[PDB]
Design a protein around this ligand. Sequence first.
Ligand code: MG
Length: 313
Amino acid sequence: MLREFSFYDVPPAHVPPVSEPLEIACYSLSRDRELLLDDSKLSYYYPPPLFSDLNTGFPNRFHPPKSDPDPISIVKDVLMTKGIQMNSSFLTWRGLITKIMCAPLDPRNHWETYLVMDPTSGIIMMEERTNQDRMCYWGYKFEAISTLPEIWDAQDVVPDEQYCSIVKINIGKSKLILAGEVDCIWDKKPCENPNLHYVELKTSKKYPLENYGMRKKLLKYWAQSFLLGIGRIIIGFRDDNGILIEMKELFTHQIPKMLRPYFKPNDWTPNRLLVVLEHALEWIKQTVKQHPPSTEFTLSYTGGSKLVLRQII
Ligand SMILES: [Mg+2]
């Protein structure tokens, strides 16, 4: 069977309450993508030199990251190994909620996720089952030059090596456990919820906020970081040569405030994106629960203004 959810059919409701995302676990990945149950790979933000060349090391010092998606079983394994209870509606990768949330924003980004309700936990688990160009490298290079590893208590661009935060976040009536890569931390991790100390690093050409493309890009920056409770998004603005010309430190909560003067009528706004997401998540829950556990579904966005949930029979 087929179910549809239309973005524009969502009733005009108040923005759902969203809890402060609470870290329940973290882990690291080695350069060979090996899971490590520690923060050996959490690094610190330190501003890189202005006019750094983001082409340096491409492609000979570049080790492109794994192309295939990771199974969500990993996060479950991690939590099980640590003896952490999982009591939520959803378990997935932050990035897959970003896709649902931002679907109304980029009709060109088509995607497909797999969902199954676990027969023991009753949690809906979501994953993908189906990268190395110069532009991508600019982003990875900016992350590499902007970060300092732990040294006191412990160049090749190897994006496989990373640190990850697993969070509980509630969006209205939906409880989610989300795992996502954290680029670095602003200062020492409170050994206090750590997430507002976390930093996301981005590289972009700078456009005025008048520019629709720029606003949309910022909205997606905001959405991604909002879902993991990240406090800061730091943008390395680059020119067409890939030279770092300016850095801009933003607080995540400031992006919607900063964008307020520039939204044209009928623009998707942070508040509207949250309303639609809550309704999307509620729809997914009710649909999945019309079937026995271990029923596999595909959730698809293939342009237009609808999500499609398909039972795999
Ligand atoms: Mg980043």
